[PDB]
Design a protein around this nucleic acid. Structure first.
Ligand SMILES: [Mg+2]
Ligand SMILES: [Mg+2]
Ligand SMILES: [Mg+2]
Ligand SMILES: [Mg+2]
Ligand SMILES: [Mg+2]
Ligand SMILES: [Mg+2]
Ligand SMILES: [Mg+2]
Ligand SMILES: [Mg+2]
Ligand SMILES: [Mg+2]
Ligand SMILES: [Mg+2]
Ligand SMILES: [Mg+2]
Ligand SMILES: [Mg+2]
Ligand SMILES: [Mg+2]
Ligand SMILES: [Mg+2]
Ligand SMILES: [Mg+2]
Ligand SMILES: [Mg+2]
Ligand SMILES: [Mg+2]
Ligand SMILES: [Mg+2]
Ligand SMILES: [Mg+2]
Ligand SMILES: [Mg+2]
Ligand SMILES: [Mg+2]
Ligand SMILES: [Mg+2]
Ligand SMILES: [Mg+2]
Ligand SMILES: [Mg+2]
Ligand SMILES: [Mg+2]
Ligand SMILES: [Mg+2]
Ligand SMILES: [Mg+2]
Ligand SMILES: [Mg+2]
Lengths: 205, 171, 58, 142
RNA sequence: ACCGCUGAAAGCAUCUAAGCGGGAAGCCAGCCCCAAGAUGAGUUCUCCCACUGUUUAUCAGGUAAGACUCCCGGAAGACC
RNA sequence: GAUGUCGGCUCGUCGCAUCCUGGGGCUGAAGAAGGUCCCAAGGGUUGGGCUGUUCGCCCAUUAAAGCGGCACGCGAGCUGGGUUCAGAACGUCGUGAGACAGUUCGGUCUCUAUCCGCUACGGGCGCAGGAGAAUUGAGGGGAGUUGCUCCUAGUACGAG
RNA sequence: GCGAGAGCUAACUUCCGUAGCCGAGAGGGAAACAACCCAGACCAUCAGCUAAGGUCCCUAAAUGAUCGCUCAGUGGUUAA
């Protein structure tokens, strides 16, 4: 249910009581409501809010129409959340309480194309026992004539990164509302200045 | 094989369709019988004959009859089962309707009664499961018992008031 | 040809095989090429052959 | 010299599967679709009738056929064999039971796949096709 | 697997022959990721609108909304 | 007119005749620890010493250190220790040249993937107008391991 | 296939006797299939009958008839 948008600002050291907590600083700036999707409107229950501000001079006629219909003023980013309401618009105030466990989604830093070691954790090869250009390669890719083919899904070199990743049960250390900042324990995927969606827990714990 | 059906005056077995219902002085009851078996009242009493005299017909026969019979004693005298708790300080009580089993499991077992059924606890070590239908009371007191089957070494558990649990004797 | 014939046969409530013994019985001696073309092209006529054949069957 | 016609018609008809044994209904439907029952019948063209199915969810199945009849899909990856029982298929997505049988009973080349189209299953009592005013066809041996 | 409820054939009994309940790290769902080329191609919000061309020139041109090309970069990336 | 052959390495995935872990009947099952049998293939199944080892014995652990299939899986993926080319030696056989599935030291393992298959990433067209965005999830993939301690409770059980 | 030896009354085994087929045999059947079952193709035909084998849909042809059997998907592969 609960959810909001913001940007990953960075990681830092703070102390609650006497242990050094590592904290990721998130800015969940205010989100306007824009679209409210219901059953008889769209089939399914959801709300579409928006995050980063955007000047008119950069906004499509159709997009302007969109935003204008709910009179909101325009945003570089829209996203949906299944099963959500209140009224007005949405700041991380109230929406999160300190101590509450949340789920943080982002887009992992992308690594480009990566061999089987870096990508999958292959074992590599003998750096020295006569190994002949087989230091980093993935060994064998199959059996023999049964089944004369290569398994579908077989892990091998490829585009590692730039993927959507959700970390579960991160703990809301601090909330400075009206700076729209959530101090969150641990680590969120994706680089500084990246987009993150924060959510209630998926799990009860 | 079996036939006679002593149906006292407080009954009303509207044998209409295959839905040979009965309504009674403890509460109305409904019961499905085979259509192709044919059952009705032909006097003071009631009766369930049958078409073919093969095997299968002789099977849904006695079944069907004993079932109407159960429905009969059901809305009539009403049904009731008796249970004994036994073993080093076991005990039960009542939560509105819920049964409060304290059978030596670190954390106790409450039991909610399905509708038509009522729990009873006289002395705290004896339980009564009573009500309209016989099948269900069977099907529930079943649960109450299985909460702890009488073990084979010391008869500890839930049993039927006069059950002769055999004791195996250990060492 | 056979396919089409069976079809027409069954439009008027007759199986093909029974339709063809029907025809042989009444000693109508038609090609099934021709029987097909009757069946497909000329409704009433095929109908008539049907009635003749179920008569031959009676 | 033998007659080749012209696909003029687009003939639409509604079948109610309520209480009908699956295979048999599958035969009536499959056949109406393939074209046979049509005196002109021409194989290399598709001349079949459009078939709406209703009340798929109430299709009959000769016991103990639910709990025992198994459908099998395969995904390409190892351990891909996914199976589901008639009862399961029938609760999750009944239309796919009917589709699956009928599709078994059509040919399997270009033309047949093309024939799948002219099937339109719906579970329960209604359909959205009243604009094609389809004509009703009774389940019968005939 | 196994445990039972009611219960005939077989007056007894029986978990079953009609029926009913309890039951695993397994099954289906729930978790996270992809996903309408799901050619069966789905839904919603929005923007542009009803142009020009002697059919010797029955399909194109100039366009709108909107993009692309090109430049400078990037926590994106072999190229794209 | 060549289907490279032991073992290791690397990479997996399957069967179940189940090593662990979960459920259950029986017990010559008091409890605890077991034995055996039935259901169960989700996941898991350690590091070393000796030998070319497969295996097997040993050290030290473990919930467990499962058995097999996949050309005794996998050399256009690596090794090249074993074996089976030419050298040399021992023992043995042979008058000899030579020999042995005896031992011993030595001894070249072929830069370019065309198609299927596989991982990634684009271009085309399609989805009955041309566009910008937001999406339902048919269907598919990943994931699925376990110890120890504590409370319950020094309670049920037990003469202890 | 039948008759024997050898073989483990094993082998898509080996060696003889005997019939047929393949070899050197197309055509229908047995899903596919030298050999099995039907059957020996001079050529043309948008003609009729049959063989083995078949007549729910893919697939030509009775969702045939009547008296039964099995309820186990036995059917759709083994034994004490
Ligand atoms: Mg990068
Ligand atoms: Mg290394
Ligand atoms: Mg293959
Ligand atoms: Mg359950
Ligand atoms: Mg582009
Ligand atoms: Mg560049
Ligand atoms: Mg060659
Ligand atoms: Mg070669
Ligand atoms: Mg060799
Ligand atoms: Mg395994
Ligand atoms: Mg071998
Ligand atoms: Mg090998
Ligand atoms: Mg190879
Ligand atoms: Mg060597
Ligand atoms: Mg000598
Ligand atoms: Mg290539
Ligand atoms: Mg799905
Ligand atoms: Mg697909
Ligand atoms: Mg999987
Ligand atoms: Mg204590
Ligand atoms: Mg003590
Ligand atoms: Mg031979
Ligand atoms: Mg031949
Ligand atoms: Mg042949
Ligand atoms: Mg054939
Ligand atoms: Mg052969
Ligand atoms: Mg015959
Ligand atoms: Mg036919």
């Amino acid at each position: 249910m609960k959810g909001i948008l913001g940007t990953k600002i960075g990681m830092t050291q703070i102390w609650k009581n006497d242990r050094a907590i590592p904290v990721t600083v998130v800015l969940a700036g205010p989100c306007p409501i824009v679209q409210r999707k219901t059953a008889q409107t769209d089939g399914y229950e959801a709300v579409q809010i928006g995050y980063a501000p955007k000047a008119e001079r950069k906004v499509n006629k159709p997009m302007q129409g969109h935003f204008a219909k709910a009179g909101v003023a325009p945003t570089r980013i829209l996203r949906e959340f299944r099963g959500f309401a209140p009224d007005g618009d949405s700041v991380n105030v109230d929406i999160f309480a300190e101590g509450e466990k949340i789920d943080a989604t982002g887009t992992s830093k992308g690594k480009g194309t990566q061999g089987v070691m870096k990508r999958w954790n292959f074992a590599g090869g003998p750096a020295s026992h006569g190994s002949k250009k087989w230091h980093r390669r993935p060994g064998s890719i199959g059996q023999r004539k049964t089944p004369g083919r290569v398994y579908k899904g077989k892990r091998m070199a490829g585009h590692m990164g730039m993927e959507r990743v959700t970390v579960q049960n991160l703990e809301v250390v601090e909330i400075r509302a009206g700076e729209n900042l959530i101090l969150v324990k641990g680590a969120i995927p994706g680089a500084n200045g990246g987009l993150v969606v924060l959510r209630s827990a998926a799990k009860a714990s | 094989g079996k036939q006679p059906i002593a149906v006292p005056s407080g009954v009303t077995v509207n044998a209409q369709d295959g839905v040979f219902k009965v309504k009674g002085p403890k509460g109305e009851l409904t019961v499905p019988y085979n259509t192709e078996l044919t059952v009705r009242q032909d006097g003071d009493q009631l009766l369930v004959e049958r078409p073919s005299d093969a095997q299968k017909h002789r099977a849904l026969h006695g079944l069907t009859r004993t079932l109407v019979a159960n429905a009969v004693k059901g809305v009539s005298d009403g049904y009731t089962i008796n249970l004994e708790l036994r073993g080093v300080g076991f005990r039960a009580k009542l939560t509105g309707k819920a049964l409060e089993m304290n059978i030596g499991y670190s954390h106790p077992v409450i039991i909610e009664p399905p509708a038509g059924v009522t729990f009873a606890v006289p002395e705290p070590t004896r339980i009564d499961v009573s009500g309209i239908d016989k099948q269900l009371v069977g099907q529930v007191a079943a649960n109450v018992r299985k909460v702890r089957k009488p073990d084979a070494y010391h008869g500890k558990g839930v049993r039927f008031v006069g059950e002769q649990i055999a004791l195996k004797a250990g060492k | 040809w056979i396919q089409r014939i069976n079809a027409g046969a069954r439009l008027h409530g007759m199986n093909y095989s029974t339709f063809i013994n029907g025809l042989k019985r009444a000693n109508i001696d038609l090609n099934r090429k021709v029987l097909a073309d009757i069946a497909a092209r000329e409704p009433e006529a095929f109908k008539a052959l049907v009635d003749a054949s179920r008569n031959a069957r009676q | 010299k033998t007659y080749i016609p012209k696909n003029d018609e687009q003939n639409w008809v509604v079948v109610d599967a309520s209480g009908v044994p699956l295979g048999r209904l599958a035969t009536l439907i499959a056949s109406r679709i393939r074209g046979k029952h049509r005196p002109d019948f021409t194989p290399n063209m598709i001349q079949g009738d459009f078939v709406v199915v209703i009340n798929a969810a109430q299709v009959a199945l000769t016991g103990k056929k639910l709990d025992d009849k198994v459908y099998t899909r395969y995904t390409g990856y190892q351990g891909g064999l996914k199976t589901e029982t008639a009862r399961e298929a029938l609760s999750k997505h009944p239309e796919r039971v009917i589709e699956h049988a009928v599709f078994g009973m059509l040919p399997k080349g270009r033309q047949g796949r093309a024939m799948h189209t002219r099937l339109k299953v719906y579970a329960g009592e209604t359909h959205p096709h009243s604009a094609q005013k389809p004509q009703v066809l009774k389940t019968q041996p005939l």
